[PDB]
Chain length 203, copies 5
Amino acid sequence: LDRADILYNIRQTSRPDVIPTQRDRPVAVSVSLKFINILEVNEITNEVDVVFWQQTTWSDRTLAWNSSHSPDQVSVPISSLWVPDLAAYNAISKPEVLTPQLARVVSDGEVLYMPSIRQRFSCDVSGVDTESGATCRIKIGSWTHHSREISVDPTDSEYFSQYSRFEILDVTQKKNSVTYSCCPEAYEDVEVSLNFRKKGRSE
Amino acid sequence: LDRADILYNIRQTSRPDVIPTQRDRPVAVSVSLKFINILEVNEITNEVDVVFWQQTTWSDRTLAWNSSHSPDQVSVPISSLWVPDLAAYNAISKPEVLTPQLARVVSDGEVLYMPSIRQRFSCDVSGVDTESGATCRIKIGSWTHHSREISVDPTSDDSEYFSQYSRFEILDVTQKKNSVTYSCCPEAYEDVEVSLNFRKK
Amino acid sequence: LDRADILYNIRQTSRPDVIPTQRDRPVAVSVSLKFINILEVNEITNEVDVVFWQQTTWSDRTLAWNSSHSPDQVSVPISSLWVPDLAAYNAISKPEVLTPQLARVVSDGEVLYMPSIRQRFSCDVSGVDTESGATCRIKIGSWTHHSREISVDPTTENSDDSEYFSQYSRFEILDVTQKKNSVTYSCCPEAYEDVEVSLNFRKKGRSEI
Amino acid sequence: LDRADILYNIRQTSRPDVIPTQRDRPVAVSVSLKFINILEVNEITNEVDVVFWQQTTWSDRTLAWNSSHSPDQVSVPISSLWVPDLAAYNAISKPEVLTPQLARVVSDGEVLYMPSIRQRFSCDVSGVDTESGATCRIKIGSWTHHSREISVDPTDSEYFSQYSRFEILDVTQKKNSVTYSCCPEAYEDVEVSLNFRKKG
Amino acid sequence: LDRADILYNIRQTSRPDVIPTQRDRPVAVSVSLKFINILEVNEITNEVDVVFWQQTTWSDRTLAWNSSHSPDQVSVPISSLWVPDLAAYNAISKPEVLTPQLARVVSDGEVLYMPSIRQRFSCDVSGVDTESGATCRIKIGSWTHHSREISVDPTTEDDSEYFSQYSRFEILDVTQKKNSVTYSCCPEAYEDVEVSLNFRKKG
Ligand SMILES: CCOc1cncc(N2CCCNCC2)c1
Ligand SMILES: CCOc1cncc(N2CCCNCC2)c1
Ligand SMILES: CCOc1cncc(N2CCCNCC2)c1
Ligand SMILES: CCOc1cncc(N2CCCNCC2)c1
Ligand SMILES: CCOc1cncc(N2CCCNCC2)c1
Ligand SMILES: *[C@@H]1O[C@H](CO)[C@@H](O)[C@H](O)[C@H]1NC(C)=O
């Protein structure tokens, strides 16, 4: 098996429309945000612009191949894969995807999709200009798949731009299960708390 | 039947172009707005930005399957389904759809489509900065299907999903159904009018 | 015949690329603007933002069907139909189409396409804040089909204009008049038809807005 | 032959990807700008917004048909035709195409494509608010085809909006052949000089 | 062979999804930015708008043909070719591609893709209005292919030969540099080119 063959088979048998549940257990999706930049904070309106890598991870056995005599990874256009229907509940603009829309697929069926995204959010910006900073919560989960079909779990400003007007004090993640008044089932989400503040001109 | 089979059948026998009338009867569409945020009010120009879930509900028996030993629901791309041609009459921008464009389909043919949308409207913003607030009316109906083909009806805490971080707060939401005859065309067209009473905090 | 059959036939045989001329005579296209809103006037730059329904009407026999025991109308995506290549000559932005892009088709082949459009125009805004108001002319015709292939004609309803106009606009409409022209450009030997819509409007008293 | 047949044949045998060179001669493309409006001048940043018809003209013999008892012209979506890969070198925004993207094709294979375009350019805006006005040069040529494959040649105030804040004093056109440090061949372009000024 | 045949063969067999590695050796990609304009500098927010030609170069043997009695080059839509998944790490907007999306292909399989791009970046704008100017670094590399699949290198071939004389700014110097980076998320190394643009406001 070479790359050409692997990619051909994947394209030929894809089913991007089919959630890869295994024996009616949920697809376990991991989500983690790597913050790159904070761009346009407004303490009056409670709005922020953020750039982040949305590290998204899951398993789709239908993509697996025997890599005994083959590459054990390929990069694949997401239009050829099933992908989780994640959305940020408190986003007030659609995601601006800054990077090539490719996922990495391992021979065992593990998938990693990690685009860089710029997006505007509605959240608590109060205190951004004090020492203890502001804490903005971002809520991400499956739009249409309940907890029996999709579960989401969480996995250092290492990637954060030194040229931002802001700095990161702390990031914490938390998992929730929510029942909305519209539907009888429960839906999982991850809440990411971003604690940040304006740098001093001197800093 | 598994999900793969159900989704394959749906895609293969699509008909996204065909309104699913069970004939002479109109497709009964339910519409309901869950307000999430109010973003950029202008009392001078009478314009507002709103974020809301557009809960849309209808029946399409051509999607039904026997779920005796199968899943009784799947998520489907709306490009593979017939979808009501709803529009907001007083919108002054096209809808910005913020969420994945999937509808939920039940084995009996019930469909739920509920995108989160950001959109700008022309409406009465006067009094927004007073105690009794402003009342902005949003009018939604089928663009091209008359009352014999599509009927729209209204379906809770008005603020249940509303953002606590908005500069505004919701005082009340009321819904109302209308049947309108336009000068251009002989038939009547239904719509729902949603009245959003809100004010600056 | 049911709706599914009618729509299937249309999709399978429609030639969206083919202007439906009958016997070397022009397709008669009717155009009419119903104004919904006037949004962002600038008297310095002579620019206006307008929202309007663009009522467009024509005949295409190739869509016809025998409706003896059938529906006599369906809604059809415009991607499955031939559509006139109308453009606004003095537009300075591309049309923002606000509504579902569907046309209504009658069993005899009559087609009605009427999207709501937001668009910016270059025109005479002078006098907008006076009693007699400004008069902005919008010019619409076929971009590439001459008068022997497409003719454009106004239609005046005999009803009041301001019927669909938003009461919440900062502006108000004094009058709307339509007029047909036939023009020959220096690039081309043939004549091209257009409709000129004259929108007479003014700013509402400032006590109200 | 009727229009339906002509259009069907064109669509079916369409090779939009193939430059229609005849016998190793370059495709001769004519370019001409008809200015409609000047919208948003900035003398500080040297930027202007312009609306113009981009009259583009060339020959593609593979489109020809016998028009003895047939129409001798049709309108065709440009997605079904080869089209020159022209670009404006000093544009700082992508072209906003305002009109239907249709070309006119004559039975002998002559093609005319003339969209109305709004676009922003980087150029010399100094003097715009003086009597002699500013002179803004727009440079247009094939992005990827050299002079042996494509040549560009020149062929307006008649179509200019009376409601613009600006007025046109003069338009001149000029053809150039240029080399670039990246490539050994020569590339043709047209430079259009727009001399304009702010009205009273 | 004529152009029509060459283009037909390429379209029919190209495999835009398949990275053209030759025996486990990485595809060698060359990247070089030719700056055309600097448009909208903001020293407060550390943001700049740049227009540049992104000269991108690589080899794909699967495109080769015998040109004995044929054209030895054609222009090809990039949708019919494999193309490197290059991204600018510090971009804060998606690339606005200003030119026709065509690549030039030589009969031996060499490809040149050079679009003009307008894009906004986050970088160090301090000193832009001084004599020594600001130095803005732009970082470009493969988003998903590691050093064993794609390597990126600067070309060894004027700082402003193509730069607009009508810009409010002027270029003092351009330097390029190659890096190999390991991120915390992944075990492999990823190559990039860092382009340093030293520029200042004209007097
Ligand atoms: C079976 C319910 O299907 C749905 C279809 N669209 C949206 C939702 N939402 C409510 C559930 C939680 N996610 C937010 C949107 C649910
Ligand atoms: C024959 C009626 O067909 C139509 C096609 N497009 C738009 C409309 N409208 C008028 C009916 C009510 N909705 C507004 C638009 C009607
Ligand atoms: C020779 C007819 O071909 C043409 C192709 N595109 C545009 C035009 N125009 C001139 C005729 C009138 N409409 C404006 C543009 C003509
Ligand atoms: C082998 C030359 O192929 C090319 C592929 N893309 C762009 C260019 N350019 C440089 C030559 C002149 N046009 C501007 C862009 C050249
Ligand atoms: C092999 C890991 O697959 C990946 C899929 N998408 C993005 C990345 N990134 C990490 C490597 C360097 N480029 C940034 C993004 C990695
Ligand atoms: C339509 O079909 C019916 C048969 O059901 C036929 O008898 C009738 O004459 C047809 N009408 C037209 C106008 O062709």
